[PDB]
Amino acid sequence: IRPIVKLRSTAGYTYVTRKNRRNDPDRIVLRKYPVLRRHVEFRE
Amino acid sequence: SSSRNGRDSAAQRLGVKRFGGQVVKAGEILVRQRGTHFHPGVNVGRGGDDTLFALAPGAVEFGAKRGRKTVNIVPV
RNA sequence: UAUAUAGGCGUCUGGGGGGAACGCGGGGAAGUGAAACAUCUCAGUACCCGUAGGAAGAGAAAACAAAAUGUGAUUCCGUGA
RNA sequence: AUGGCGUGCCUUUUGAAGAAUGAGCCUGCGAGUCAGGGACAUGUCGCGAGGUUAACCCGGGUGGGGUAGCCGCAGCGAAAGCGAGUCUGAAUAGGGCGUAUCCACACAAGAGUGUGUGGUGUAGUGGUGUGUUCUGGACCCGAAGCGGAGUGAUCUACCCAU
RNA sequence: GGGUGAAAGGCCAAUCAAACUCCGUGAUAGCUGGUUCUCCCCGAAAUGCAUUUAGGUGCAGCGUCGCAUGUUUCUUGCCGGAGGUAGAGCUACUGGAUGGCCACGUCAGCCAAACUCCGAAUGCCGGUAAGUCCAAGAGUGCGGCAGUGGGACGGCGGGGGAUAAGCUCCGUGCGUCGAGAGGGAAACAGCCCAGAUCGCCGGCUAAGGCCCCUAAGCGUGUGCUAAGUGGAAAAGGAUGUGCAGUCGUGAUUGUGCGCCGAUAAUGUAGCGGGGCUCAAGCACACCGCCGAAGCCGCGGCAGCCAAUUG
RNA sequence: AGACGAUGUAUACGGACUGACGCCUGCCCGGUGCUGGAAGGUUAAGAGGACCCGUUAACUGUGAAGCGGAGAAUUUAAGCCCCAGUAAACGGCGGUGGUAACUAUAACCAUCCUAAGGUAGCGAAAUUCCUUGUCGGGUAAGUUCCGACCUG
RNA sequence: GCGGCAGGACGAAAAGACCCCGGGACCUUCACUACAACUUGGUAUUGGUGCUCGAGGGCCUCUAACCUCGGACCGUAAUCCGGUUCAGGGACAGUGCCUGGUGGGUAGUUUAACUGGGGCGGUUGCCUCCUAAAAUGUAACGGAGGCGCCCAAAGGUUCCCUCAACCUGGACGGCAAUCAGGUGUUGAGUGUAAGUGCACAAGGGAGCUUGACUGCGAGACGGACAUGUCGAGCAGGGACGAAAGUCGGGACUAGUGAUCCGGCACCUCUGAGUGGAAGGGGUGUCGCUCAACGGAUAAAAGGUACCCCGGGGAUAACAGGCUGAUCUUCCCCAAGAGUCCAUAUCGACGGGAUGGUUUGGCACCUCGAUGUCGGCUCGUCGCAUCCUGGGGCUGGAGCAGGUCCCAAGGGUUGGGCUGUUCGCCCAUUAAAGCGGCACGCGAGCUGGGUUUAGAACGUCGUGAGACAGUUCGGUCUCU
RNA sequence: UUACGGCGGUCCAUAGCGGCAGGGAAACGCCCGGUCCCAUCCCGAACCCGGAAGCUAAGCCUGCCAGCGCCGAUGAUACUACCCUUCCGGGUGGAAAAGUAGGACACCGCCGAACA
Ligand SMILES: [Mg+2]
Ligand SMILES: [Mg+2]
Ligand SMILES: [Mg+2]
Ligand SMILES: [Mg+2]
Ligand SMILES: [Mg+2]
Ligand SMILES: [Mg+2]
Ligand SMILES: [Mg+2]
Ligand SMILES: [Mg+2]
Ligand SMILES: [Mg+2]
Ligand SMILES: [Mg+2]
Ligand SMILES: [Mg+2]
Ligand SMILES: [Mg+2]
Ligand SMILES: [Mg+2]
Ligand SMILES: [Mg+2]
Ligand SMILES: [Mg+2]
Ligand SMILES: [Mg+2]
Ligand SMILES: [Mg+2]
Ligand SMILES: [Mg+2]
Ligand SMILES: [Mg+2]
Ligand SMILES: [Mg+2]
Ligand SMILES: [Mg+2]
Ligand SMILES: [Mg+2]
Ligand SMILES: [Mg+2]
Ligand SMILES: [Mg+2]
Ligand SMILES: [Mg+2]
Ligand SMILES: [Mg+2]
Ligand SMILES: [Mg+2]
Ligand SMILES: [Mg+2]
Ligand SMILES: [Mg+2]
Ligand SMILES: [Mg+2]
Ligand SMILES: [Mg+2]
Ligand SMILES: [Mg+2]
Ligand SMILES: [Mg+2]
Ligand SMILES: [Mg+2]
Ligand SMILES: [Mg+2]
Ligand SMILES: [Mg+2]
Ligand SMILES: [Mg+2]
Ligand SMILES: [Mg+2]
Ligand SMILES: [Mg+2]
Ligand SMILES: [Mg+2]
Ligand SMILES: [Mg+2]
Ligand SMILES: [Mg+2]
Ligand SMILES: [Mg+2]
Ligand SMILES: [Mg+2]
Ligand SMILES: [Mg+2]
Ligand SMILES: [Mg+2]
Ligand SMILES: [Mg+2]
Ligand SMILES: [Mg+2]
Ligand SMILES: [Mg+2]
Ligand SMILES: [Mg+2]
Ligand SMILES: [Mg+2]
Ligand SMILES: [Mg+2]
Ligand SMILES: [Mg+2]
Ligand SMILES: [Mg+2]
Ligand SMILES: [Mg+2]
């Protein structure tokens, strides 16, 4: 199953993308760029 | 009591839209081509669709290089 | 059955029915339209019931309005649209 | 006398003299209408940056008033808003939609011609004619059936009294 | 939507799977029918897409009228392009596949819509020089009003069918009919010739014809055909016959006509009739004439355009 | 309201199927009904109203009282769930694979399956497709007819 | 002109009843959605003590509300209806409001289209190849296959690398594991169908990373429209790289669903007296096998032989038309069997036609009607001759045959069984021919068959009902 | 200028792949080592850095070979647009593939090298 996860900021849900529950558990933290205007780490 | 087949996809016009000596504006498209039959020369880009398109304005050639068929714009 | 009623008796006054449309109150369709069809429409229309009067209803703010801003019962017409 | 040539009319069809439909005949009646400050095109006429009144009141009438209102005149935006600008946006970054239009000059040079100073200066609106259209039966004829309020057992089905 | 029913959906005033009458009501119908005077100018479509849609309808395509733009449109010659069909080819791949030599390999002869080392003609897109140009009554943009959305057959390239059908579904700046009369094909929407403004008791032609019906040749020259072949047909069969080939007679190969095979039901009845070989048949030559509402001639009308006449 | 039932009272009245008489009426309670039982599970209204949210005297952003918006838990009844009865309730009634001392047949027996596997009686029938089944009677000749057989 | 006969005028009559199409009507049920009716609780009418399970419920009893179609009595010179009064029941029943359940008992409806007629079957959107006729585009129920995803790397970027197969040499270990070394230019590999591409790699490795970004976009492709598709370039702030540079997911094209109405977070946009709030609005995004995939509703199946109306020859059954696969009658070549001998007589395998008489294909005439199988009555024509008549050949002694050619003048029986046609049989005969003519002939006849309404049987269906399955009954109009 | 070394261009083999013999002056090469910068899914092989012992034996370069591969007319034919033809067939333009004649061991452009 490939569910629809929203990415939130540490400050401040701009985005949402498909990742799965089986191959990638402990849902992902990456990084990404509007309110702040810098690339801030985003967690699931 | 027959025909397991009888389906087809929409055609998608897919052909050289600009031939030979033509005046072609800067962003103007040419040869749509699935799977890059023609390769990009000097003043043509290639999109992520394998669609070619002009970079500069000028006159379209159709030449070749290293065996490959090439499209390119030369300036007026 | 007794305080009395229910009834009974005698007497005076009224009501009962008809009418073309308009009135106000209450019940209240369907075909139709939605290119089907239930919500919705047709329509509070047809039809029915009560009850009028020359007209009838409504009517004398437990009303509108938005302050440098006021109008002043109700009904009906034009516009807002 | 005779000779040449020549398969009704309408409807509906790929195609009808059709053996496809419709009419025995004649005379008379029988199908595109009218209402609304309706809507959009388009003539024509009044007045023009303005045009025009509706209820209504005064009249012997079709003639006088009556400025409430509607349309034009500034836009862009979801809106607050600001306005030849405005909106999205961090943005004298682009792009969207407006600035009547057509001219010269300036700059830019270019990726299809842009931005400005200067001149020119716009045309709508109210009657009425025609086309079509909206809401009404809306060009005329034709169902089987649906609902409402009544009328029927002197025919027939059954029961009751005699 | 009730009655009655020893039960059939029977009967309820000649009508009943829901009586009758009036009113809603001029109910509604993507359905069938009907719509009435004239002339002028122009003139379609039967396709694409979407559809509780396929016989309806929306938008585009094609028509018209008016306002813009003023040859861009169409045609032909040049030029610059991309293509993967026809054809061909395959130790050039991918399969299928025949016979030798020794499965492979080698030596040959192949086949293909979904095979391609190859590869046209035509069409297509652009640029350009003229032509048409008192016209195509063009092209493109915007608007008022449309209708059409059941096509048919013929030619050429295909699919489906049995390579059957007057079959069915497609392509084609393909034709005609639809919406085109006239002449030819005996008769005969789709075939050949040709586009009807009107009048004439005038000519010249087209396809197709010229013994008589029937307008014009019993036309002329050199051959063929004996079967009424001409005036239906096959696989085959055969000392019919005319010419040109090839080792006075036999074989042999081409080729022009001809013979048999040949045979369904009202009456000849497979020339349109008569009649034709004393060719009116067939083949190639060659002069003529006939023949249309075409073209021309003379005269009268009207539409658009540019100088009443063209 | 009242009426018929009925100026009747379970030997009566209403409904369902079957259809004089004779001999009979087998097996199935899974499904669906109907009848009873209710110990629990789930649940509607109505009660109940923790915790939130809006506003504002007080405190400079912090929140109690008034007022009113949202309303959770916890509470129940019949039904359904659940357990029984009932087939003259609606209905339902099996499969292949082997075996006898010549052949053939299968008393019998193996193994699946279901709630249970069609009993008596009848059978080419108002039921039988192949079909004018085959056999006997009737006829010079019987796709009909009558009597049997059973591959219903 | 008159008397007659009925073959035609696709005769007259009835806008076909069959068939399909779309409108209606009744009927059915585990279609949908209501409602009646029935039952359940709460709460009004509705009160008083008692005993208890309780975190207001369960019950006891009483009489005064309310009930009795129990009696007597009176209004009253009547089995109605009131009033009085004894006897009963009793805060229960009934009734109002609220509310769960059961609910074809009724009501309004729905129940797709394509389709070589309709039904049954199959199919419906998107991607790829061929049909497709060398631009693009292009039909069929033509021929082949896929999709409703997966990947936190299978993305980004900077580097480096070359495969499969094949031959030769090696413990386990072989025409398959790994090991070296040769020939090897594309066969291998590409997350996933096929095609177009890709060896310069888009194929195979590794290091760091998250551009699988935010605000935008000149210009074209493609299209009825709504969709869809490519995009240099500019800015912010980042990744990799020394740099130039590339990066807005993936070699490419399938992996998706318009609007409406809701859900969540975000923003000082508005806040119907004012200041707040509620609600609205914006930006970002979530909920549809709306798969019949441009989605008619949030919500829907069947029957009609009881049928009805509007249409159609746009579309079936009968007949005509074309076709001739299949049937039918001849024919070409002879492998053969006939003692030997292909051709007395049969003739396999294969090939070519005739006929339109069977089963079909097609949908051209007729649905504002071309009325129906068999039989009877009456025929008429063809010859592919059953008999009679004339011939050749014979594996023809004779008698009686066989086979082929010629010939259409006449003649070609009566019964049994079945609705039959056909067929089997019976007794005869010189012989018991085959076909066409709307499978000749119902304005000439019959009505047994088929094919309306009644009804039972077997079967399928929950049911209404259905069956080229049986069974018995069933208006034949016209001067 | 000569058998030199780089970096290119061609609608990329008439340039290729083999065969046989030649070349080393500067340069390109193999080579010589692994401390320094930098590397291996293991190895200083390769990628790097540091040097010049030993040689042209290989790469690279230049000859001469039609040995494979490639290029390829002319002339016919297939096919074809348009036309004419009552089936058949031809008329005026286009015109292949295949095979054949033969071509071919490339041809150019400006930057160095040692000798001018
Ligand atoms: Mg409607
Ligand atoms: Mg309608
Ligand atoms: Mg027709
Ligand atoms: Mg027409
Ligand atoms: Mg007629
Ligand atoms: Mg007639
Ligand atoms: Mg008719
Ligand atoms: Mg008349
Ligand atoms: Mg008539
Ligand atoms: Mg009625
Ligand atoms: Mg009576
Ligand atoms: Mg019945
Ligand atoms: Mg009657
Ligand atoms: Mg009714
Ligand atoms: Mg014209
Ligand atoms: Mg239209
Ligand atoms: Mg070919
Ligand atoms: Mg249509
Ligand atoms: Mg069509
Ligand atoms: Mg067509
Ligand atoms: Mg055609
Ligand atoms: Mg054809
Ligand atoms: Mg046709
Ligand atoms: Mg003459
Ligand atoms: Mg003569
Ligand atoms: Mg002559
Ligand atoms: Mg003849
Ligand atoms: Mg004969
Ligand atoms: Mg002449
Ligand atoms: Mg019975
Ligand atoms: Mg508070
Ligand atoms: Mg007579
Ligand atoms: Mg008739
Ligand atoms: Mg009809
Ligand atoms: Mg119903
Ligand atoms: Mg249909
Ligand atoms: Mg069919
Ligand atoms: Mg083409
Ligand atoms: Mg194409
Ligand atoms: Mg091995
Ligand atoms: Mg407020
Ligand atoms: Mg659709
Ligand atoms: Mg739809
Ligand atoms: Mg009818
Ligand atoms: Mg027929
Ligand atoms: Mg007929
Ligand atoms: Mg037809
Ligand atoms: Mg008629
Ligand atoms: Mg004969
Ligand atoms: Mg007959
Ligand atoms: Mg009759
Ligand atoms: Mg008759
Ligand atoms: Mg009968
Ligand atoms: Mg049953
Ligand atoms: Mg009888």
UniProtKB/Swiss-Prot annotation, chain A:
It holds the Pfam family Ribosomal_L33. GO terms for cellular component: cytosolic large ribosomal subunit. Keywords: Ribonucleoprotein, Ribosomal protein. The keyword Protein transport does not apply. GO terms for biological process: translation. The keyword Ribosomal protein applies. GO terms for molecular function: structural constituent of ribosome. Signal peptide: none annotated. NCBIfam families: PRK00595.1, rpmG_bact. Belongs to the bacterial ribosomal protein bL33 family. HAMAP family: Ribosomal_bL33. This is Large ribosomal subunit protein bL33B.
From Swiss-Prot, chain B:
The keyword Isomerase does not apply. It comes from the Bacteria. GO terms for biological process: translation. Keywords: Ribonucleoprotein, Ribosomal protein. InterPro entries: Ribosomal_bL27, Ribosomal_bL27_CS. This is Large ribosomal subunit protein bL27. The gene is rpmA. Signal peptide: none annotated. The keyword Ribonucleoprotein applies. Belongs to the bacterial ribosomal protein bL27 family. Transmembrane segments: none annotated. HAMAP family: Ribosomal_bL27. GO terms for molecular function: structural constituent of ribosome. One of its GO terms (cellular component) is cytosolic large ribosomal subunit. PANTHER family: LARGE RIBOSOMAL SUBUNIT PROTEIN BL27M, RIBOSOMAL PROTEIN L27.
